[PDB]
């Protein structure tokens, strides 16, 4: 926050409450949109019922969710059973304020973001650990080892790819020289769309975030059709809804962070509109991700662990070392453009055999 002002604390609180309730409405209507987009993918159609567009069916669903006999299972830890959903939900909600939705003041006077901490990616990493925390903790508290095992699968896979996230995020810091999202964004304003320089890191960040329940491990696991996943199978009225809510908010937070970090967080080369381009990139990644959800298989999380551990994380650290050599010798910044373009050409030509 070198160049950016700070709103009053009451205004920060207001913006925080706004972002939280907006993530509520966002995940609800994005569940609607994913239902209907999957329905379009498989030639059927979505809920033209209780809507018109189905947009009262989340209301009916929430109204069912409450009054639904929130049950505290016996032989489960009385306190932890209740406590774990709150953790998983809070630490998924937060860490979205950092994302700048405009130049300073473009929130109709005050601040596109909530907080613009000087060290951003570390905040993201830390709060990403806490999702896996909630997952395996609820797995334990469920008092069913069947669910616990899935929670452990989850924790193993998510932890692997969450470690990979760090080596992925290393590279752009060398170029920007700041850990503030707005500084990185302005660097992408000047030189342009950091992913053009760091395409391998972009790819590994994408595939790592896929492991964060997005899809294709798909041995996340969900209870369906496998050794059941963790964090669910014992919650009935509100806590299960909270688990799914947090998983979706993390999904969309990653879908927003990918353009925010690697691509052009809003800051378009042309027309520089504050919010719309960021939301459009969010929607783009959301649609591509739903395409993946529909269109790709499981990994058994053994192949997933093997792949993440042996391929993604070594590749990310190799690219980090190359970029570190380049920045230390500082020779051009054009060499990184050339290198990323050639790496993309290589990782593409190997497909069409």
């Amino acid at each position: 926050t070198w160049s950016y002002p700070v709103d009053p604390y009451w205004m920060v609180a207001l913006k925080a409450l706004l972002v939280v309730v907006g993530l509520l409405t966002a995940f609800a209507f994005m569940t609607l949109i994913e239902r209907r987009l999957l329905a379009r993918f498989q030639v059927r159609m979505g809920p033209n019922r209780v809507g018109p567009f189905g947009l009262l069916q989340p209301l009916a669903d929430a109204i069912k969710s409450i009054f639904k006999e929130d049950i505290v299972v016996a032989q489960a830890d009385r306190f932890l059973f209740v406590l774990a959903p709150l953790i998983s939900v809070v630490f998924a909600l937060l860490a979205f304020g950092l994302i700048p939705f405009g130049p300073p003041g473009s929130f109709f006077g005050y601040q596109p973001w909530v907080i613009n901490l000087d060290l951003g990616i570390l905040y993201l990493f830390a709060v990403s650990e806490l999702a896996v925390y909630g997952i395996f903790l609820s797995g334990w508290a469920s008092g069913s080892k069947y669910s616990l095992l899935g929670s452990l699968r989850s924790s193993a896979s998510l932890i692997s790819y969450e470690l990979g996230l760090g080596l992925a995020l290393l590279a752009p810091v060398l170029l920007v020289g700041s850990l503030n999202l707005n500084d990185i964004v302005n660097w992408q304003k000047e030189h342009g769309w950091l992913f053009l320089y760091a395409f391998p890191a972009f790819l590994v960040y994408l595939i790592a975030s896929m492991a964060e329940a997005a899809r294709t491990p798909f041995d996340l696991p969900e209870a369906e059709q496998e050794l059941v996943g963790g964090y669910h199978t014992e919650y009935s009225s509100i806590k299960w809804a909270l688990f799914q809510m947090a998983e979706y908010i993390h999904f969309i937070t990653a879908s927003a962070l990918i353009p925010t970090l690697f691509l052009g967080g809003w800051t378009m080369p042309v027309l520089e509109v504050p919010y719309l381009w960021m939301f459009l990139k969010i929607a783009f990644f959301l649609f591509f991700f739903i395409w993946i959800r529909a269109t790709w298989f499981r990994l058994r999380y053994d192949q997933l662990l093997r792949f993440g551990w042996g391929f993604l994380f070594p590749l990310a650290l190799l690219w980090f070392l190359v970029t570190a050599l380049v920045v230390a010798l500082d020779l051009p910044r054009t060499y990184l453009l050339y290198l990323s373009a050639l790496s993309f050409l290589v990782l593409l030509g190997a497909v069409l055999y």
Partner: protein, 166 residues
Amino acid sequence: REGILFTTLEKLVAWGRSNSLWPATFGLACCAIEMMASTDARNDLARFGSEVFRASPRQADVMIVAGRLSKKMAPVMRRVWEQMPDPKWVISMGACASSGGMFNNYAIVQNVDSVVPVDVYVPGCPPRPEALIYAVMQLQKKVRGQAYNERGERLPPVAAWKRTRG
């Protein structure tokens, strides 16, 4: 609190539950495959509110018993039902479930209402997917308090609200 004790609130929550009816299939026989057909891309029970399908029993209000219920499966289905959240309803799909059907013998339960409190019955062998949709609208308007029998009586929103579980 069960969705009761205010004229507007209870109709609103019944509206919500009726449209948010969460099916949990208990597939037993070919009735189960004819119910899987009620989800394909010709006639989908994915519009009224039954898009999502959580295999867990802790997560659904509607229990759809689709197929012949063998006496060896009765306690399992019994406990799957007991392990459901409380605002829960029971649909009995097909002849084998409703009555003993054409299999009138030692192996099959002659009325699933023996083991679980049944809300709706739907005859047929198999009952057509559109007959199943008629049954779910029937249950919808039942939990709306819009359901009457041939004797003139209004039917309670939730069966299994009237039993001394134990």
